[PDB]
Design a protein around this motif. Structure first.
Motif, PDB file in Angstrom:
ATOM      1  N   UNK A 176       9.480  55.260  38.380  1.00 20.68           N
ATOM      2  CA  UNK A 176       8.800  54.504  36.892  1.00 20.68           C
ATOM      3  C   UNK A 176       9.600  55.154  35.692  1.00 20.68           C
ATOM      4  N   UNK A 177       9.679  54.608  34.557  1.00 17.26           N
ATOM      5  CA  UNK A 177      10.001  55.339  33.296  1.00 17.26           C
ATOM      6  C   UNK A 177       8.847  56.225  32.631  1.00 17.26           C
ATOM      7  N   UNK A 178       7.724  55.937  33.251  1.00 19.25           N
ATOM      8  CA  UNK A 178       6.379  56.849  32.921  1.00 19.25           C
ATOM      9  C   UNK A 178       5.248  56.120  33.155  1.00 19.25           C
ATOM     10  N   UNK A 179       4.105  56.357  32.403  1.00 17.35           N
ATOM     11  CA  UNK A 179       2.905  55.474  32.624  1.00 17.35           C
ATOM     12  C   UNK A 179       2.435  55.393  31.165  1.00 17.35           C
ATOM     13  N   UNK A 180       2.428  54.161  30.874  1.00 13.76           N
ATOM     14  CA  UNK A 180       2.045  53.608  29.591  1.00 13.76           C
ATOM     15  C   UNK A 180       1.326  52.355  29.560  1.00 13.76           C
TER      16      UNK A 180
END
Ligand SMILES: O=C1CC[C@@H](C(=O)O)N1
Ligand code: NA
Length: 396
Positions: free
Chosen positions: A347-351
């Motif tokens: 993933x590119x992050x968690x948002x």
């Protein structure tokens, strides 16, 4: 110094029990990293023993086996809310169960974080207390069609017809429906759209129909027992699809390849996780080593990787809230914006968006080759060449 209690609901008995057991082991892995002091550069919550935001308070969990039954999941959620007084919920694998149980916590005003249920409808309910960390089947189906489009451009546009076969509860229905809609929108011809019950003792009529029609691509959405039945039946009737692209799950059960052996050769599934990403994401190796001490020595796979990631999101939100108040936890989930640095998935992050869905997800396709799943797509992120056509039963 304030502790916090989280309810955890998974299927720990029945046909998908290994999924639930390994998911719970993943949560226990997270708790080990959180509650104890660990030297893991790049991993929030590792260094401190307990949550700095709670003055060193520890996370505990209460675990419930829902047996794959929404009504049981609802009852267990009620008891966790009313008797155990949990401040958040986590679970529950099956979209059917997650949907029913998260409606209870929604009404109670208790945040629910989901790691691995993929019905797109779960985040279109207008809820405020539901947060989902996995990609959903809109995203995963998009990935399937990007793969089919790219294969087509490279191979004379030869993938024209699709056969969809799916279990009939929320997940399978929504998966098959998503695929059907996207097929129509992209000009692919759906030549079978088959619904079945996951507990069925026969798929022979369904396999006969698929063999006769012989779609260019087979798109199954099956849980574990039905996936095994489907493949066993396909072998028994010598049904040889050239390309099988599965919506995970039965096809990512922790024991899928161990159970099916050569029968699984050539199968493709979507996933956010493979251990062959570890040179790109060395955190995988770090967490795997700790997971093994909780899992009876078994490696991470799809569902535990997703559950671990989801539980870390929840833990980080609580830490950031500096409170166990459910409303402050909710607001911290709304505010969460984790980088990719700590993750074991690409993933590119968690948002989360306003609908509670993680905006920064990404997936891969992986194929069984020589006894292991291997990343095959996107073609730029791949550990090996796609095997096409799938070998026939006689060649596996
Ligand atoms: O990715 C997955 C695992 C379980 C299934 C579901 O939502 O029921 N989808
Ligand atoms: Na820690």
């Amino acid at each position: 110094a304030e502790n916090v209690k989280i309810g955890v609901l998974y299927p720990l008995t029945g046909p998908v029990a290994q999924v639930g057991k390994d998911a719970v082991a993943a949560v226990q892995t997270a708790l080990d990293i959180i509650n104890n002091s660990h030297n893991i550069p790049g991993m929030p919550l590792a260094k401190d023993a307990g949550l700095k935001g709670l003055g060193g308070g520890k996370i505990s969990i209460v675990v419930g086996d829902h047996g794959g039954k929404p009504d049981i999941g609802v009852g267990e959620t009620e008891k966790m809310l009313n008797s155990d007084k949990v401040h958040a919920m986590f679970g529950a694998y099956y979209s059917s169960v997650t949907g029913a149980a998260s409606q209870v916590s929604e009404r109670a005003g208790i945040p629910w974080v989901n790691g691995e249920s993929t019905s797109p409808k779960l985040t279109t309910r207008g809820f405020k207390y539901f947060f989902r960390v996995t990609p959903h089947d809109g995203e995963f189906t998009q990935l399937m069609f990007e793969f089919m489009d790219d294969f087509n451009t490279k191979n004379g546009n030869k993938l024209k017809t699709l056969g969809i076969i799916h279990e009939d509860t929320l997940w399978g229905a929504d998966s098959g429906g998503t695929q059907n809609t996207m097929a129509k929108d992209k000009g692919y011809k759906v030549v079978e759209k088959i619904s079945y019950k996951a507990k069925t003792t026969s798929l022979s009529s369904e396999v006969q129909r698929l063999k006769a029609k012989n779609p260019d691509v087979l798109l199954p959405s099956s849980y574990t027992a039905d996936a095994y039945l489907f493949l066993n039946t396909a072998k028994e009737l010598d049904y040889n699809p050239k390309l099988l692209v599965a919506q995970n799950a039965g096809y990512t059960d922790p024991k899928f390849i161990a159970t099916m052996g050569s029968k699984a050769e050539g199968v493709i599934t979507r996933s956010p996780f493979n251990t062959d990403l570890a040179t790109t994401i060395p955190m995988i190796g770090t967490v795997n080593e700790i997971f093994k001490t909780h899992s009876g020595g078994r490696d991470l796979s799809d569902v535990p990787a997703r559950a671990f990631t989801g539980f870390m999101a929840l833990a980080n939100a609580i830490n950031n809230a500096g409170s166990t108040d459910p409303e402050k936890i909710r607001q911290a989930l709304v505010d969460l914006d984790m980088s990719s640095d700590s993750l074991i998935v690409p993933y590119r992050g968690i948002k989360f968006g306003a609908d509670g869905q993680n905006e920064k997800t990404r997936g891969i396709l992986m194929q069984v080759q020589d006894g292991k799943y291997c990343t095959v797509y996107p073609f730029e992120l791949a550990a090996c060449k796609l095997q096409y056509p799938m070998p026939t039963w006689s060649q596996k």
